[model samples]
Target: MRERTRINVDASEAVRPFNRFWRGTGFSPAELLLEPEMRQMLAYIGGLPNEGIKFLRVHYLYNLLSAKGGAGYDWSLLDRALDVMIEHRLKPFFELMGNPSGLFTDYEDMDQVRRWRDLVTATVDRYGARYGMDELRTWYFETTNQADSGWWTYGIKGYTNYYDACVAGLDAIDPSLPMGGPGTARTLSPIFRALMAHCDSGTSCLTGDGPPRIDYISIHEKGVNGSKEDLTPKTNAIVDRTLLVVDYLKEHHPRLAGLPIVNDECDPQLGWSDHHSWHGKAYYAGIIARIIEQHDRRIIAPKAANFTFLSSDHAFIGGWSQRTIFAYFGSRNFTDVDRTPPFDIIKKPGLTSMELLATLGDTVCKVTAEPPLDPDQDGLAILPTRLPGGGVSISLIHSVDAINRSGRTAVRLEVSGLVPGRHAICLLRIDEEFTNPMEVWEAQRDESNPRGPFEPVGAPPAPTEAQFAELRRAQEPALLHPISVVACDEGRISVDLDVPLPSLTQVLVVPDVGVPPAAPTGLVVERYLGLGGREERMLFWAAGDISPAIFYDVLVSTDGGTFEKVSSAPLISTAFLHMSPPEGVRYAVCARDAFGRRSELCLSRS
Candidate 1:
């Protein structure tokens, strides 16, 4: 271990929700439903705690319109995909993408504008029939995806026409439906600048329609040549690029300056083929931690761009195959389909890292590390959240670039402004050894190597289902059992943390305030689909007295077994709307006092 890093946390200084920013998959709805492997993949996503995936960014919705050789719009596959998202409580980011070559022979042809309008109106009508216009409006609708890429054959002029048509079409169906984008791949590309200029001009489209309504701006960013140096520099450069885009908007596009910016797709590196080493490892965890730090510091909006859903082409795990284009950056000569790949239905370090971030409370607290650490190298990133009832939740990542350095760090946290009483502390960690199924499997696959435990065998037997189960069990992240509760002396709380290199640790400090009010009696849980049937809203009502109780903390169980904290922010009112809650989940409510005392769990039978 190296020298200790000090973290100063002030519970009184509260910020925005730590996990409010969007975190979701970026892929087509069809790919999510059509692929057999996707079933397990989506299930794995659904199984994540704390409503892990809140948004679904459909990358190729336009493909559905042109699926049957431009015969007509096919709603079957798209509808099925939407249904799956609803079932899993994943609301659509609602992206409009592709040139739909079937409709437009080329970007120069303005005739496709009408066709684009038709597609938008038809989609709105269909969703309105299912989820009501009101609920549909709540979901975001982006203009197009990665226009700079080859997939977007259209040039700048084509994008303007497409944007005007999409907005007009969506408005015709329901003017209330929110829309935004160009979904530019580069931050300050000419296309992006032009799109913003077009929107600002308030000029009429070819159809004589008014300006397009942009709810939020979206862009894509990826760090290239990450292997050449320590990841911190790359991460810092990416951050600078993203922030520079924000700065440009704030300066040139004053109208859109205050609007939320969504990095619709942000990855640590350019090629997924190069992702094996970091995908399910502590290195990835540090990357995630740094991103979260950006959010906590308010440098960026909460919504983040997770890489993808399934793997068929070169994305995610397709890099495992030597035939992959960027195989030079990836695993070499390892193609045993039976060996169980890194990117599978199981939760990997990438997913778990996000999961840890999601565990943070809604309200952010002021937590800073002296002599700011760069998460890319040997730096420490500390994020703390002020939980309901004066408690605190802290997430720390002692990040060190594994490629360039090695060593742990002793961490000391000094937290003030607590309730000045004994507090319960629970710790959870994601290191190289834990929450790393990919590493575990890689070892077994190469077990015959000199690094193996036993003698090299020519060929090991194909893995059994039991073997996969054991791997899953072994790879589960450690939830430090028997959390310690320490006394807060003189309004000061201190705790020591051990964060190994490239590892992340999340600690929940629940302070014992005053006595908690008894659980509310006669609890009723109601489930109803929102307007578009896109998501289910769980409304729990109870008739009981919560005297001296300022708020209620709702707890939900999706499988009716283990319970996870559904709300970190206490509900002042009796009725709490659990938006897009998982289907078949049970609800319970507990009352908490002003300090942080939580009452017994109140079960809702209905």
Candidate 2:
């Protein structure tokens, strides 16, 4: 058992930043595609200790297929792509989809559009057998190529059958391998319902018998089209799409818990994903953070793919070569900077963020943050769990606020009802120093090239046994950082942590903070009725829609000389600001937003 430690802080609610797309090589010009080297690239990513990642998705493959132009894709060429992922210990959440080729399918290309099942089946059989039934229990198989409808044999139903057919074939070869589908355009709820109708063992071929031929589910809530329509839905629609599935399950397949939904193909773009500016490298980590939070909180997706990894040089990066290989240096990919700022931030030793989050097991745990942040405030959990038993971990995402934001949250963390006694406290933070290999490499490059195309340096060597052994002496959060605690202790356990006002994000690992009680539903505030407009008192700063479980403070002074916090248990709402200001004094109230963004409003007795 590890020693227990408690973490406390005022986490910043930096509005979720977009870190959607990542740098994965594009394989369109299959000629330049080198398999062995590509394998190396994936190895680099796999080597990265990204334990906080609950799901492993290959981002995009259908588009990768579409990149083939279908001019007769040498199935072998595609195999190399999937091979890289398989080798990296990652399961393919196969997005079984693609665009119709003008020369082939009449469906849209107006001919006999290729089924792509050959490539699909080849991909399935190769890994399907290798993955072996439950060994690959985590793989998500689905046809998610965008613009896939015309490529199908018919319309939505036709497309649904086509997807089911693919599932049946894949199952025949290996029933152990699960498949999901329709990776439909938008909230394809209607089609999903149709597919759901056949998921039972009886109709196994169609719906895999009420259990759904496709074990998982998928949809693309990709923002808006060219019109750049309301971008709000871009993020909100994800919730809409996800909730649709849960609702569907509750309505139809009451017995079945529900299908694990996968947003296999989701990014800001419509066609070529690499086309978007937001899809660059510096933004990758941020996009990933928001998505992870969203997936965990809203969708409860076991896995969510971030499109593609190093697919090609020119696509995400500017250079492509049969031998031009490099890590995801997006910031440097386009420029000669040698390294991206974002990469530098993650490499910092202080940011064991990924490592800390890794411990947040598989089930959604109940977690609650005091005044500063509350889950019920926004109709969702803030640090919601994707899997239970996974202890609750807090993510203090690094942002400019620590440098610029006002409040500095430093307090105590108490997790009650722990198996207790002793637990290890693991803290991970990404500052400007640690993992910045590019900077080190660039310096070395500059020194060597004092005048030239210097030899590119590889990553800082993998941490060795000695490094592991010396971890304790190594300082701040690592795999072995230990903490000691006694079970059922009222004080819980507290660790000293100081977050630089603004840093990207910091991850803190501690025992599960039992999820707080749900905000009470009943609250009667007799304001306007009993208290006249002159004596009218409004309760502002009220959070959680007036739930009794929240907390807030109100302050007023008659002469505005002395001020004190008017304590209110389970505080909520801004109505408190208007409270009759005690006749001569002004008043102010405050509350925190969903992401921990706090607000304070002042009022006067008008």
Candidate 3:
């Protein structure tokens, strides 16, 4: 192996709780998420919970409300806004801001603060009453986005008073409904301290009550600044700043410090609007996996945190933003990106990072390695986790701050803990060449390969149908090599892989459990006309049995040829929508379980 490093994981080592804090994502303009056209994408996120995503933080829920001129509010629009999550089976981590219809002209206005309190109380009551307290209690209520913004002219005293009112509002229903604040833009804003003090001992501005109820604390921390050109992602800053806040919380408010800390707006970069090439490539993927590992070690493993939650706020549409999970082609809808239905929206490598993290087990295992590959120290790392189903998951990542070309680094992984027997080794990789569509996308866009020995002065921004399939097939992370079987001699398995710089590789080793899920049946393929007179092929089937699976892989055969895996990744849904189906094609569906078992293919007639 080149630049060799060895990782020895003993599965029987002391373990700790593996908090899935990376289980959340955020986006703004709540209205856009409610669009009917967004159902498929929402269902895509729906597939994430099985992967471990829980809370979905949304901005501007208040945008859906209209105040009746000092009267009650019309929460109808907001109701419809959150229904998207409800229908998709995601919990709400709702942000309380975005004044609708000039509902509150100035937060500095005491009159406005009072009205805001009542608004918070009324809204909380409404949601609690509608959804019932059982589920509502599981959600969170963040005071506002980036309290350090000029928006916090409400001042520390005013803002905490507002926070107190929020506490009062939630106490009106179920005090357990989590209320957190100071979702500031910086590491330790004055408001962050003030809110902690208020929750600990400060008087409530709304009442004479001493000390308020604060279930958690939030702060937004990012690595890169707004200048997309001169920025390199310093993901270590998030870890450093998080510990900085944790230390302060521990010292200043010892009694209340241990509350679940949340970096509700954690990201590799400061702004989502800033566009850069790395955002669509493996650079983003490496950093995402890097940060999760960082938090697991620097924050949670030490118990420097609790049910800590860190959310990436780049779930919007398009690559221009350099912050979204899906790339929308043909038409750039801008903020209204999803309005164009039937357009090509494929996964970016960043989303694949989340999928990579999902491969990790629920328990952290001890990895004994010399010259340890810690991202915070040397940029190379191997994290080993014990899977829930008696499997071992190994994630190898190489991350460098600067966005530039780098060489591949090779490493050897040796694992122990599985019973001696036949095992399946599946290698999943994400890099510029694997699970990244930007290469093919640019090649298609420029009418030349990205290896670049030519010019594209007249290349079209819109791609041909052929470009669509290439992008679709490239987005999904594929097995770097075909599934292979190996023996665990004396409970040990070892393998060597060369990982690209700024890349992520997930190695899942499962014992040969008998019987994979039954082959997906009822494999039906139908082609139909759409509004634009274009044909769309629909492939839908039922799971073979109660094997508990996320999605079935769809394979395609042409002109009676052998069936080949066509999907770049497992379809999140049971049905696959082939927006650009090739002529004279047949389909097959196969089911796979977490235990490295696969079902026989169920084919559809040509």
Candidate 4:
């Protein structure tokens, strides 16, 4: 028998929607042009769950801009990339950037300021014309990426001057166009504070607009343990520092206190080497959950920087890098894809945890956990949510500070204020077995030979497309057996379970009450030409809500004759990258719901 604890919930009261807040990553426009595979990966990443991604931060805008004397510019390359993002419904959080030679006489010269201002005006004008003024206003334009480095490389006055030029030019074009930044290395940095003071002082080059408009505060957050390798310390550091920055904003920059604070770049550690141990394990779940808790509890927007990385093999995957000694002793970037298959096995653990966290309902419901249990101490965090219809979901993670290990304890969950009858409870587990596919691969590798340090007999042949599809399906999270649900005399329920260390468990309490039916709707397909003259296809559809749909089926006509099942994607996904289909081949897509209902098909032109 498992130990049980009582938990209480009040259904009568509910708080504001958890916001879904925001999550995104940084990508260099140059990278997109340099690597065609990057576009494929971006499509996959942007099509992920939770309304896909809110926006993407792009750097190296100057790389695409060819200076036309004073402030006139050409943005053909920039427009190319921006078009793709907009097609996927991913807005660009543009970062005004780069220091190019010959653009000006001096770094802080008045000519430089005018150039910056002209760049801003040109960008806004172009986007307004292309994407429409209304849609352009929805996007964000920032001063620079890591302006602290810019300040150091150039000068404090130089960076501020650049920022002022950008804001003023943007306001002149369309004040409704969102703009803000000084994107600091961290919100607590001295450079960021200095920039804030400069903005508030109102003593600079601004003649008309009183003060520069700050729609949002952008900062980076990272947890680096210089020596001691404890996850908790670093995890706590991020939250603490984030709160500190928030408090500072409230105190010093009260005028901007109400503005949303976005941690545009966040990671567990500073470098890419820690991806294996820190990012691809259950410990990462603890970190993400705690961050989300802060967002729900403290109101800090979060964005995981560089969310998608291209595997050297030209595949978009997770945990693409690892710690190496090349820096001090030897230096080399060993490409994993070149040496191995392009299977996206590494990112499963972290992505699973992220998906589970995103599963919670919009509105947060109050739930309490008692003594002997601390989220940081025992590595257990609980997020209870009230579903829109008439149910509840409780997301729980049993996290450990160290590497791979389940916590030593179990938890008893109790809930009250239900409809007071029998309900169905389902368990979704993403522990070592469910989420971590690499574990099985590693164990199989070790067992293949009796001798130590075993090697495979021969190189395995590449998987067929069908085989690859199965591999992808295997990477998805699995649902487990039913957990009995019953309401007590006072309309309460309780369940007991033990969560392994560094694992996530979701308990969904669904009432038997009647609710309106939800079926997939509005299916549309569009065709477009990708870079390098490749034909690409995408699907668009309308669904009742997030809860009903499971996955979408992409049907294709290779011969333009008969349709056949080709690919499938998550319900949250509305687009697919199908490049260079054979002549006469057509494409169509359909949606499959949880109840096994199929949506009307949408077809693309030949």
Clashes of each: 11, 100, 0, 7
- Which candidate, 2 or 3, has the higher lDDT? 3
Quick one: ranking by lDDT, best first? 3, 1, 4, 2
Give the TM-score of each candidate: 0.73, 0.50, 0.86, 0.77
Q: After superposition, how far is residue 306 of candidate 1 from its true place, in Å?
A: 20
How would you encode candidate 1's per-residue C-alpha lDDT over 398-453 as one tens digit per residue?
Answer: 76434445568887888778877777666668876665555555665533254466
Candidate 1 is scored at a TM of 0.73
- lDDT score of residue 98 within candidate 4: 63
Off by over 4 Å in 3: 68-71, 106-114, 335-342, 445-460, 518-551, 555-577, 580-590, 594-606
Clashing pairs in 4: 5-412, 273-322, 273-323, 326-330, 406-500, 406-501, 407-501
After superposition on all C-alphas, the RMSD of every candidate to the true structure, in Å, is 9.5, 22.6, 4.6, 6.9
* Poorest 10 consecutive residues by lDDT, candidate 1: 321-330
Score residue 44 of candidate 1 by CA lDDT: 39
Give the alpha carbon lDDT tens digit for every residue of 1-606 in model 2.
012223332221122322212222222333222322233233323322222222334434543443345434435544566665655544444555454233224322212322444445555665546556564556656564443444445565455555555665566566666676655565645555565565533243243354435565556655345333212214445555566665666666654335555555444334432333222221222333343455554443333222221111122222211112232322333321112122111121211233333333333333444444422222112342222222334444322201123222342454433344333344444333322222333233222232345555433232222221122122222221223323433424455544332222333333333433222211222222111112333332212332111223455666757656653321221222132345565554444322222333333232
- Candidate 3, residues 1-606, lDDT tens digits: the string is 237788788876737756567888878778767653344556556554253456788888888888776668777888877776776667888777778687666555667767777787788788778888787877888888876777636667667767776777777767777788778887777777778877887777667868877778888888878885757778887888888888898888888778888888878887676677687888888888888888887777777766378888877766534688877654336553223444556778767788777656778788887556556666787678776656677788888777785778767888887777777777888887788787777666555434465644322355555666677777776667766778676778888888888799988787766766677656556554322335556555555543332346777777788888866566534556576456778777777765545676564653
How far residue 195's Cα lies from its native spot in candidate 2, in Å, is: 5.8
